[model samples]
Target: MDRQGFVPAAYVKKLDSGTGKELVLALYDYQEKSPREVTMKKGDILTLLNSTNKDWWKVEVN
Candidate 1:
């Protein structure tokens, strides 16, 4: 949650745009939150699926 359990208005799946960078787009406003956009290549794993609620996949970072 942002604060006190408040959350964003929407949740959407986002993909990269450029050749080799990753980008995160907010479904509600289509805002680009990442510095660059890249395609998800072969074997790319989605570590988090933050839909109506936040979920961490089997893989963990850090």
Candidate 2:
């Protein structure tokens, strides 16, 4: 979790831009202070569902 977070590339399941609309690479990791947010890490691949205007976004982790 980035308080501010890496892992084996082989272990990470490869994801694609499916119904998620878009795929974003997390260059800088970010963590949340509550459950409403998700913990992200560098090299993390995120399936971006949408966004809150421009700053915030919704995604799928599972």
Candidate 3:
């Protein structure tokens, strides 16, 4: 059977302080267009830092 693997948390340069309890994987490349945007490449692992918006999520790149 296939199982998931653990991924270590990475230090964010943008956020002053942030810790993620939930993690996410990017399926597509998301480039920044606005000031409050977080760019992430495809296959990049990201941590769910903030999930209040539901539509716009804040994920820390790992």
Candidate 4:
């Protein structure tokens, strides 16, 4: 098992959508300077990598 702690999706603050649809989260690649869709479902657990300014969080998904 990895030494990092896994945080549930519930702990993270989700963006508010006016349409009320399922929120989509993205995995940002710092090197590529681009964001990719994260194929995660509700209740999924993610490893906390880093957070800057609390606006965006870097997480790792299995």
Please report the candidate that would top TM-score against the real structure: 3
- The segments of candidate 1 whose C-alpha lies over 4 angstroms from its true place after superposition are 1-10, 29-62
lDDT tens digits by residue: candidate 2, 1-62: 23211222222333565673576666665655566666676777766655443445665543
After superposition, which runs of candidate 3 have C-alpha atoms over 4 Å from their true positions?
1-20
Local accuracy of candidate 3 as per-residue lDDT tens digits, 1-62: 22122222232222333464665666666666665666776676566666555357666554
Best by lDDT: 3
TM-score of candidate 1 against the unseen true structure: 0.22
Query: What TM-score goes with each of the models?
Result: 0.22, 0.56, 0.61, 0.38
Model 4 agreement with the true structure over 1-62: per-residue lDDT tens digits: 22322233334544455453333243322221234323333454444555443554555555
- What is the overall TM-score of model 3 with all chains considered together? 0.61
Which 10-residue window of candidate 4 scores lowest in summed lDDT? 28-37
Mark the regions of model 2 whose C-alpha exceeds 4 Å error after superposition.
1-20
Candidate 4 ranges with C-alpha deviation above 4 Å: 1-37
In order, the Cα lDDT scores of the candidates are 0.29, 0.51, 0.53, 0.41
lDDT of 3: 0.53
Clashing pairs in 3: none
Candidate 3's error at 46, in angstroms?
0.4
